[PDB]
Design an enzyme around this catalytic site. Sequence first.
Site, short mmCIF file in Angstrom:
data_model
loop_
_atom_site.label_atom_id
_atom_site.label_comp_id
_atom_site.label_asym_id
_atom_site.label_seq_id
_atom_site.Cartn_x
_atom_site.Cartn_y
_atom_site.Cartn_z
N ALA D 68 0.83 -1.20 0.00
CA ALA D 68 0.00 0.00 0.00
C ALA D 68 0.87 1.26 0.00
CB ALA D 68 -0.93 0.01 1.21
N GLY D 111 1.96 -5.62 0.79
CA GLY D 111 0.69 -5.95 0.17
C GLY D 111 0.84 -6.83 -1.06
N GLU D 114 0.74 -10.41 0.01
CA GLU D 114 -0.62 -10.71 0.44
C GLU D 114 -1.54 -10.94 -0.75
OE1 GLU D 114 -1.25 -7.14 2.61
OE2 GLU D 114 -0.44 -7.92 4.49
N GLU D 134 6.81 -4.87 6.95
CA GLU D 134 6.00 -4.01 7.80
C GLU D 134 6.68 -3.75 9.14
OE1 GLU D 134 4.98 -6.87 6.54
OE2 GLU D 134 3.36 -6.48 5.12
C1 LIG Z 1 -4.73 -3.38 4.46
C2 LIG Z 1 -3.34 -2.86 4.09
C3 LIG Z 1 -2.45 -4.00 3.56
C4 LIG Z 1 -1.09 -3.49 3.08
C5 LIG Z 1 -0.35 -2.72 4.20
C6 LIG Z 1 1.12 -3.11 4.24
O1 LIG Z 1 1.44 -4.24 4.07
S1 LIG Z 1 2.39 -1.84 4.56
C7 LIG Z 1 3.19 -1.38 2.99
C8 LIG Z 1 4.21 -2.47 2.65
N1 LIG Z 1 5.45 -1.90 2.15
C9 LIG Z 1 6.58 -1.73 3.06
O2 LIG Z 1 6.49 -2.06 4.19
C10 LIG Z 1 7.88 -1.14 2.51
C11 LIG Z 1 7.74 -1.11 0.98
N2 LIG Z 1 8.98 -0.70 0.31
C12 LIG Z 1 9.45 -1.57 -0.79
O3 LIG Z 1 8.80 -2.52 -1.07
C13 LIG Z 1 10.73 -1.27 -1.61
O4 LIG Z 1 10.87 -2.33 -2.51
C14 LIG Z 1 12.06 -1.18 -0.80
C15 LIG Z 1 12.24 0.24 -0.22
C16 LIG Z 1 12.10 -2.23 0.32
C17 LIG Z 1 13.22 -1.45 -1.81
O5 LIG Z 1 13.04 -0.57 -2.90
P1 LIG Z 1 14.38 -0.17 -3.82
O6 LIG Z 1 15.60 -0.18 -2.94
O7 LIG Z 1 14.53 -1.16 -4.94
O8 LIG Z 1 14.16 1.35 -4.45
P2 LIG Z 1 13.61 2.63 -3.52
O9 LIG Z 1 14.29 2.60 -2.17
O10 LIG Z 1 13.92 3.93 -4.21
O11 LIG Z 1 11.96 2.49 -3.29
C18 LIG Z 1 11.29 3.68 -2.93
C19 LIG Z 1 10.58 4.20 -4.21
O12 LIG Z 1 9.36 3.32 -4.49
C20 LIG Z 1 8.33 3.96 -3.99
N3 LIG Z 1 7.74 2.96 -3.04
C21 LIG Z 1 8.20 1.76 -2.76
N4 LIG Z 1 7.41 1.18 -1.87
C22 LIG Z 1 6.42 2.04 -1.57
C23 LIG Z 1 5.30 2.02 -0.73
N5 LIG Z 1 5.01 0.85 0.09
N6 LIG Z 1 4.51 3.07 -0.68
C24 LIG Z 1 4.75 4.14 -1.41
N7 LIG Z 1 5.79 4.21 -2.22
C25 LIG Z 1 6.63 3.17 -2.32
C26 LIG Z 1 8.84 5.38 -3.37
O13 LIG Z 1 7.92 6.38 -3.70
C27 LIG Z 1 9.99 5.61 -3.90
O14 LIG Z 1 9.84 6.34 -5.09
P3 LIG Z 1 10.60 7.82 -5.13
O15 LIG Z 1 11.99 7.64 -5.69
O16 LIG Z 1 9.80 8.76 -5.99
O17 LIG Z 1 10.68 8.35 -3.72
#
Ligand SMILES: CCCCCC(=O)SCCNC(=O)CCNC(=O)[C@H](O)C(C)(C)COP(=O)(O)OP(=O)(O)OC[C@H]1O[C@@H](n2cnc3c(N)ncnc32)[C@H](O)[C@@H]1OP(=O)(O)O
Lengths: 260, 260, 260, 260, 260, 260
Positions: D68, D111, D114, D134
């Site tokens: 998300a 997500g 999931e 998370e």
């Molecule tokens: C009911 C709800 C269910 C779902 C709720 C959940 O599970 S919680 C959400 C789950 N996600 C997380 O916990 C962390 C997610 N992050 C990732 O997946 C990413 O792959 C990572 C950071 C671990 C590794 O990415 P990389 O190293 O390859 O590259 P990078 O670090 O630049 O990744 C950041 C870039 O992707 C975008 N980005 C990545 N994940 C994002 C996220 N969850 N929400 C918003 N934006 C995200 C950023 O805007 C940013 O773009 P910009 O360069 O413009 O800044």
Amino acid sequence: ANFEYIIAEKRGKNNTVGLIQLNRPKALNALCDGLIDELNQALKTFEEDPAVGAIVLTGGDKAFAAGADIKEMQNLSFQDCYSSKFLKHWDHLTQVKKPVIAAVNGYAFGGGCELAMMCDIIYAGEKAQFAQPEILIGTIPGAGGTQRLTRAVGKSLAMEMVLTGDRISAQDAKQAGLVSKICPVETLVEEAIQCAEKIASNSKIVVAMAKESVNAAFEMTLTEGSKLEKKLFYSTFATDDRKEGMTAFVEKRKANFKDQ
Amino acid sequence: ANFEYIIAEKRGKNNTVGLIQLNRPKALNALCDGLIDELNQALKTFEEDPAVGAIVLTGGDKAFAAGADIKEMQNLSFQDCYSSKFLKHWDHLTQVKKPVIAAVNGYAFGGGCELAMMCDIIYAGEKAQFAQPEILIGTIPGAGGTQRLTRAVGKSLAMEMVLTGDRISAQDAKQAGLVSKICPVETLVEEAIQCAEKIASNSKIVVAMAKESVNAAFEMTLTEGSKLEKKLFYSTFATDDRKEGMTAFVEKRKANFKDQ
Amino acid sequence: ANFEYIIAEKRGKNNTVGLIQLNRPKALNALCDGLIDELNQALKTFEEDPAVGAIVLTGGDKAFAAGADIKEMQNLSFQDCYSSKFLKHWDHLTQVKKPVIAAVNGYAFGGGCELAMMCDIIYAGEKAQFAQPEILIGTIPGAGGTQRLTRAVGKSLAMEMVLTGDRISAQDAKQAGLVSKICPVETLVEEAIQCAEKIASNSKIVVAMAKESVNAAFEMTLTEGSKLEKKLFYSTFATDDRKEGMTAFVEKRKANFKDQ
Amino acid sequence: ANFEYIIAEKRGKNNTVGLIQLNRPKALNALCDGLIDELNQALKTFEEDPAVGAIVLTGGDKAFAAGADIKEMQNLSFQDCYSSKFLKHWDHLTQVKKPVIAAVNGYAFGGGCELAMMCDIIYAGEKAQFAQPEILIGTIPGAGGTQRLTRAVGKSLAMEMVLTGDRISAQDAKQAGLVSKICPVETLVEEAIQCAEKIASNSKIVVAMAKESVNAAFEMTLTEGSKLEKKLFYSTFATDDRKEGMTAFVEKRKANFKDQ
Amino acid sequence: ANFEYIIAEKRGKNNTVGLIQLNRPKALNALCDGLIDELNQALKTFEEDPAVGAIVLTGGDKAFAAGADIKEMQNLSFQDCYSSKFLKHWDHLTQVKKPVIAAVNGYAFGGGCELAMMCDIIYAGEKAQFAQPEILIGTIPGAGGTQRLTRAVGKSLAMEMVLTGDRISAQDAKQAGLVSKICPVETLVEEAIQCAEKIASNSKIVVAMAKESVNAAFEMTLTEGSKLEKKLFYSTFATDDRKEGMTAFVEKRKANFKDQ
Amino acid sequence: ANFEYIIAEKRGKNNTVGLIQLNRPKALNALCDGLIDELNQALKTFEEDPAVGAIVLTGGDKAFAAGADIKEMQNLSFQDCYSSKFLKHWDHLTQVKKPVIAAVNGYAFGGGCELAMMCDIIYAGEKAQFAQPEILIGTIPGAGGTQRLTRAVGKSLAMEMVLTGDRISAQDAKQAGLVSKICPVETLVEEAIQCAEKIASNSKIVVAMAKESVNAAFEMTLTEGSKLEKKLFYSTFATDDRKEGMTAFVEKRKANFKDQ
Ligand SMILES: CCCCCC(=O)SCCNC(=O)CCNC(=O)[C@H](O)C(C)(C)COP(=O)(O)OP(=O)(O)OC[C@H]1O[C@@H](n2cnc3c(N)ncnc32)[C@H](O)[C@@H]1OP(=O)(O)O
Ligand SMILES: CCCCCC(=O)SCCNC(=O)CCNC(=O)[C@H](O)C(C)(C)COP(=O)(O)OP(=O)(O)OC[C@H]1O[C@@H](n2cnc3c(N)ncnc32)[C@H](O)[C@@H]1OP(=O)(O)O
Ligand SMILES: CCCCCC(=O)SCCNC(=O)CCNC(=O)[C@H](O)C(C)(C)COP(=O)(O)OP(=O)(O)OC[C@H]1O[C@@H](n2cnc3c(N)ncnc32)[C@H](O)[C@@H]1OP(=O)(O)O
Ligand SMILES: CCCCCC(=O)SCCNC(=O)CCNC(=O)[C@H](O)C(C)(C)COP(=O)(O)OP(=O)(O)OC[C@H]1O[C@@H](n2cnc3c(N)ncnc32)[C@H](O)[C@@H]1OP(=O)(O)O
Ligand SMILES: CCCCCC(=O)SCCNC(=O)CCNC(=O)[C@H](O)C(C)(C)COP(=O)(O)OP(=O)(O)OC[C@H]1O[C@@H](n2cnc3c(N)ncnc32)[C@H](O)[C@@H]1OP(=O)(O)O
Ligand SMILES: CCCCCC(=O)SCCNC(=O)CCNC(=O)[C@H](O)C(C)(C)COP(=O)(O)OP(=O)(O)OC[C@H]1O[C@@H](n2cnc3c(N)ncnc32)[C@H](O)[C@@H]1OP(=O)(O)O
Ligand SMILES: [Mg+2]
Ligand SMILES: [Mg+2]
């Protein structure tokens, strides 16, 4: 909207009760497709409305709901009942978060008893009878007629009502556990509105959490149910109405809940 | 066959009811090995017979069933209980697909109450009594005395009856939910036969599906139970009795079921 | 010990009953931290004592127990409630193996009704009023006020009592299945002591096994419940009290159980 | 419709595969509100369409779905998350009756994993990675990250991935049981389309019944699961494709299923 | 008896193993009515015999069992299949108390896998292939082909095998968790006999209790399972083989169990 | 305190890991009453300590834990097992809120495998071996040997290990799903300490909520499991570390969790 089968209005003090009256004195309130659609639309409207705190379902003075339209699902096959647009939107009554009160003031057979049991509080009058006459037409209930009735009343009486289609009085239903309070046939709607006002006078989020905790008693075990109850009780410490009620009880005054 | 402990006959209108009368006044219908074997044989015969639609279980006028023979299971050990030769045939009453009506008259202690609760409909007389005297002999129930009784009556009264062995009247059983209807001791068999006729007058397959749907309330959750009930209701559209009953209800006539 | 909130004593014939009376006529027996700690200590002492066979929980004449202390849990937060010693030692009443009898006199609100329902046998008087007034302050039950109350009374009445907080009488509790007996307020303690004597007069191990079998009716299914019941019935043939009671029943004499 | 975040098209021979490609390379396919809404709309369109028999969910060549949008739900509170429309439409993927194939061709964190586990078949590429980060941001999974992952992989590896956020390769996921096949990143979509064609070449109603039977393995017990399986197998004798397939197997020819 | 479809014999050391070989090469060991009847008779004979401690199920070298006879259930209707005349004696393999070892050689499709999943230990050969070809003919599994397969192997692979009918190798089955040991097709029967001898060399009652404890892991929760396991462990102390084995371990000698 | 059987210390970076090493080479770390008491005391101390965030359980170099003391429970009867003096304090490992890591080295038979499976993460060395040799002494597991092993590995391999006592290597355990990751026998403690540091480096309350969510996968269904997971995810928004991490992720910095 311009509902033709039902009438949805805002009753109660300060317009905090959503009254859905089944207006169809020609087929004992047959649950057809249009009637169910209008009921679901009214339930969704009352759920999205921030003023309505509780919903009250009420039928006619002679028959609450005679169930689904038998004259419509007659020429249906196994395919048109296992994958079709017929008889699919029947669980919307259990998906709402706000409490729903069923006011049965007449005949509640088939789908009527199911819709009554799917609610939280069941108010019935003296001239109200419940039965499962599906066995009289070579069919079985399909919306909790054999699941909730067995867990709320018992095994023997539910078996008898399902296999014989015998009608039970309101006194027998109250003695068993189907209903919770017997009211006169002329003041049943008034008592339902008063109960809805008493329910809506509290915090909406806490009421929803309590409803979920009570509903969890038919889907989980006792240990896991108590664990989820403890978790929800701990999570309730993140709102503002809780501390307001605590301060009101300490200072001996009325708690002004703000639904937050 | 030539049963010595019980009497299995075919009563009711058009010979559609199977009546099993426990004939053992010198031991209050003690559930011994031969009596249980004859009961299982009679149940199998009534299940394989296409004319019998419902079964009625009845005991004596002074006592329905005093339970298992304590004089036979006295000199038993822990190894003899796991050896499947002494007390294994007790769940067959729960394996039949046709409804079984229990006519409780007189003392129904231990195995009697268990066999009554294992049935679908429980009919008790005005002088009927239920109790669990196992704690009086240093034993515990083993055929649903602590499982079905607790879910049907409640936790408190079941705990009291199990830990004290106190007797309860038919009025208390109806108030708590153990029995569904109280009939006189002289006309209980007639009411049971009438109920069996009312059950055996409908489609046998639909009755079996309804019985399975009701029994699925103690083994499954509410959501899964409702989904299974929906699946069975959809599968009921594959039989001819359902369409016949719907056509009869539309045309306002009597439905002639052919068990198909 | 020197209990400052409760009184634990040994009553009954031959000192076989453990009476715990809530001695606090200043806050309607508010379940504070010290009171709950003393109650748990008394329960542990009565469990470790071999002479006490049953425990009797009794409150005051005006009110059994008003519940947890609101003044203590007022200035609490989510993080403070989650990981702390606040409202944690509330499941010790369900961990004891000996039966606990609840003698409710007066009001039973919040924690009082929960502690009463967590017991095995619930005894109340004519002037007894059970309720769950957590919604009036913005909270929800958290010790079985929505799990056991729903499975023992019903869905409708539990929903009503949780969403409104209405006061129910002991007659309605007995009719629904909350309480088992209705005794006078001046002799309820005597009836509870007599029931505890009748319970402790049997084999303690068999009583504990029966209590576990009855408790397994809310945590397991019907098939697995019956399987565990059969397993426990087969395991009961390894003690001497079983054979002693069987020989006493055969020889028509009194069974001298030795708790072995 | 004119989607701005995803691309829903009809791929495969005879247009029998529904391909939903997440088009968002600037945020690693962040599951925002608009993207979830478009995904639900595409799923509903493919469900109502009679030609599409299977759905294939595919992301990008570097990241399937990064969960998300953390930036959107950043300035939220308890009331804003619970009693609102934030993170609510996430179970629709589990509501469709047609099979959905998840083609993970890159990073599937939060997500993404999931949504992949909520599908029926999970196809992961050589560079696919699964993790639960998370715990790295102070949150927890909420769409099956701790329920399906534990039951499909194991307790130890799920605990490790949830408490540490470590990533796993496709080989470890296949060895544990998370994915079924491992395909190259250049032919993963082709294998997914071929699997969808192999699924959408049989009777749709039988496919839905089999999907429900397989999904019932995580909601019920073994005995009731087998009972429901027997009931569905018996109900399958009411269609016309079963007899056609049996006749084709007997006569050694190809079965022409008509989805009826 | 003179079995025509199968061959039941007493193999192993001291004739302690019951070997049932499916002798039907012309139909890939099609599970017909006579074959199932002979298998049930052989299982009953091996269960009633006190010398046989374990049973080994083995098929042919080209195919273990291709499932039920489709040519027999071709011209069947819903009413005929719902009656207790066709496809009913399929749970007997799950009713035996002695362990059953399944030796899979060649093709194992449909029931051949289902029965293999109804056993305790699954031994497959190097040329063994498991699949569920029910969707290819328009049917679904009905003897535990979607319940045990999903809980043991996983959700994704089971969904794939059910919706596509793909064949998996013994290596993939062991990697997923279907089988426990892979042996050559020339010495698989020898390894199965050795495993049965190792099983039949211990206390039969303790082996049955352990089998029940392992089978009770898919019928209830983890807490109830652990409590039932503790109860069975406590009940195991009532036998003599337990103390004999303990003394043998203390005195450093071989334990001479007497099956008591 | 001065533990004689075990050694409890504070290892890891900044003393955030609780290491409990079993010191008993003369008996292969026999789980006696004193050793279990010291282990429970050390677990309680590490739970009450605010600095320790994770616990690591490690045995000897040649054997992790050879189960309970067989030479102590030899002269025990059926009455000595249902008391509260022997074999009762075994479920304390599953009651702690902080994660526990099990470092398995050498032989882990009987109680050792049970204590390993009761932990969240299972780390086994190259020479680690798991088996259930209770059947070799006429006993059965009692602490999850037949409940967790079956759900984490499978039915066939668990049945084989229980009925034969065969030993499995760490490779087979990782292939089945018993252990998470394999490490050398000389660097397993270092990897366990690193994993404990990575676990404790996050918010303690969020880690506890995630542990509860993962443990709920064996106590509830999939629907109620997902509902409880959604409820916990919504409740997580009431903490400060959640918002701190969600802000640090956007600001691209390190989240400084404050355990609140
Ligand atoms: C009911 C709800 C269910 C779902 C709720 C959940 O599970 S919680 C959400 C789950 N996600 C997380 O916990 C962390 C997610 N992050 C990732 O997946 C990413 O792959 C990572 C950071 C671990 C590794 O990415 P990389 O190293 O390859 O590259 P990078 O670090 O630049 O990744 C950041 C870039 O992707 C975008 N980005 C990545 N994940 C994002 C996220 N969850 N929400 C918003 N934006 C995200 C950023 O805007 C940013 O773009 P910009 O360069 O413009 O800044
Ligand atoms: C998922 C779906 C739910 C699954 C569960 C189900 O199967 S739901 C369906 C099951 N429901 C039932 O079986 C209830 C059937 N209803 C009855 O048997 C009877 O109507 C009654 C017991 C209520 C008593 O009725 P009365 O004695 O007042 O007389 P009468 O039957 O003529 O009622 C007047 C009008 O109501 C109509 N009517 C009554 N019930 C109806 C129904 N369920 N469907 C259609 N029409 C109905 C009559 O046809 C008649 O239409 P006219 O004006 O033309 O004269
Ligand atoms: C799966 C297994 C399920 C569980 C199995 C069980 O635990 S079942 C066992 C549980 N225990 C019981 O059910 C209670 C035992 N039954 C009773 O005590 C009676 O029902 C009673 C309370 C009405 C007391 O009887 P009365 O006052 O009428 O007088 P009496 O005791 O002499 O009973 C009349 C005759 O019946 C015999 N009798 C009574 N109950 C009997 C029984 N369960 N088994 C065998 N025989 C029994 C008496 O020995 C006596 O025979 P004679 O005088 O000619 O010698
Ligand atoms: C894990 C735990 C489970 C979580 C669920 C819960 O328990 S949540 C909380 C449960 N619900 C409650 O606690 C509310 C209980 N309310 C009552 O008992 C009261 O009886 C009542 C408001 C209905 C009014 O009846 P009365 O007029 O007879 O009693 P009233 O409160 O006015 O005054 C008499 C004395 O009762 C005491 N009293 C009543 N409830 C009390 C409480 N929760 N904590 C402390 N004291 C309490 C006051 O000290 C008061 O003395 P003073 O006022 O002079 O000082
Ligand atoms: C509750 C009830 C249980 C639930 C499960 C079910 O009922 S569902 C039924 C489950 N079984 C199935 O769905 C299909 C099973 N197996 C297959 O389809 C196989 O893969 C296959 C036919 C392609 C095998 O190909 P082969 O090359 O080895 O052999 P071939 O193609 O020449 O012909 C098959 C030969 O084996 C026999 N044969 C194969 N499957 C059979 C079956 N289910 N019932 C009867 N006989 C079968 C035929 O007699 C036939 O011999 P003839 O040439 O002389 O005719
Ligand atoms: C919930 C309550 C319990 C749950 C159920 C259980 O767990 S019941 C426990 C399960 N049963 C077991 O685990 C079997 C015990 N396993 C073993 O003893 C061993 O691992 C083994 C025989 C398999 C292989 O060991 P080795 O060959 O390397 O060494 P050895 O044969 O000398 O092992 C015996 C030596 O270790 C000690 N020893 C080892 N295990 C012991 C045990 N469970 N109880 C007491 N003592 C034990 C003996 O005192 C003896 O030391 P001395 O030289 O002084 O003689
Ligand atoms: Mg009741
Ligand atoms: Mg696996």
